């Protein structure tokens, strides 16, 4: 699944 990550998906 080539889904885009949410704005905050990479924040702790």
């Amino acid at each position, epitope marked *: *699944e080539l*889904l*885009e*990550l*949410d*704005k*905050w*998906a990479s*924040l*702790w």
Partner: antibody
Framework: RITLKESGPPLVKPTQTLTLTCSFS??????????VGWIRQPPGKALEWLAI???????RYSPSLNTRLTITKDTSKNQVVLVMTRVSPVDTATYFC????????????????????????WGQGITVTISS | LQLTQSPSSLSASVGDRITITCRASQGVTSALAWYRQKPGSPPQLLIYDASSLESGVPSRFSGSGSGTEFTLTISTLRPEDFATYYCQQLHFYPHTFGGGTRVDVRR
């Protein structure tokens, strides 16, 4: 203290353009990382995510409805607008706007993702019917 | 991405303890919210970030899970709890809601 309210026409004819406005209070779209999203609910059915716009003018759309959708903001009026072109009767639904928190910040530093993972306050909803 | 809620419907009585499940087709970390919706009203947030209790929300509500399996729990059902519940994932775009779980008065 946060309130949102949808406005627009209750009836639109097929092929026409629907413009919905969210008017809010108790927060500012200048708040770092704040979002305003749109969600709809066809009669008798479940919630369906439509779009979201952020303080930085970052926006995202439903893939299935994305050619018909535009989302805009005026941070000084405390309003967000959703435009949906070429409406058709499938588009009959209750439309909600909603607030998304920005992350926890400490003296301006984002220190925690948590709080962003919900839509925390919703507007009451506006019923829109599409019919000729 | 698919979010699957189960059951779709369930019967219950005041004072009951109920458990609603949400599974994601792929991992969404902790980015999962639960809402209650009463007929004629907008959804109301119960739980954010999978397990965090929203301010002002009665303590009977709780949530658990991370990755793909999530559960909402109402420890003691109150009259206001006969309603429909939805989960939503906010880890990927588009954000997606589950199909809903109707909770009615058993007889």
């Amino acid at each position: 203290r946060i309130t949102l309210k949808e406005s627009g026409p209750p009836l639109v004819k097929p092929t026409q353009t629907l413009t919905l406005t969210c008017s809010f209070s108790g927060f500012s779209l200048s708040d770092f990382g704040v979002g305003v999203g749109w969600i709809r609910q066809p009669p008798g059915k479940a919630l369906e995510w439509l779009a979201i716009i952020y303080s930085d003018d970052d926006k995202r759309y439903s893939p299935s409805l994305n050619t018909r959708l535009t989302i805009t903001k005026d941070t000084s009026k405390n309003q967000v607008v959703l435009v949906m072109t070429r409406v058709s009767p499938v588009d009959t639904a209750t439309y909600f706007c909603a607030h998304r928190r920005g992350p926890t910040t400490l003296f301006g530093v984002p220190i925690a993702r948590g709080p962003v993972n919900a839509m925390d306050v919703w507007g009451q909803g506006i019923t829109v019917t599409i019919s000729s | 991405l698919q979010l699957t809620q189960s059951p779709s419907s369930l019967s219950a009585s005041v004072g009951d303890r109920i458990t609603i499940t949400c599974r994601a087709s792929q991992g969404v970390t902790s980015a999962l919210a639960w809402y209650r919706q009463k007929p004629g009203s907008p959804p109301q947030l119960l739980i954010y970030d999978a397990s965090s209790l929203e301010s002002g929300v009665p303590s009977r509500f709780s949530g658990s899970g991370s990755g793909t399996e999530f559960t909402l729990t109402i420890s003691t059902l109150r009259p206001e709890d006969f309603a429909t519940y939805y989960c939503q994932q906010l880890h990927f775009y588009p954000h997606t809601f589950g199909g809903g779980t109707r909770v009615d008065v058993r007889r």
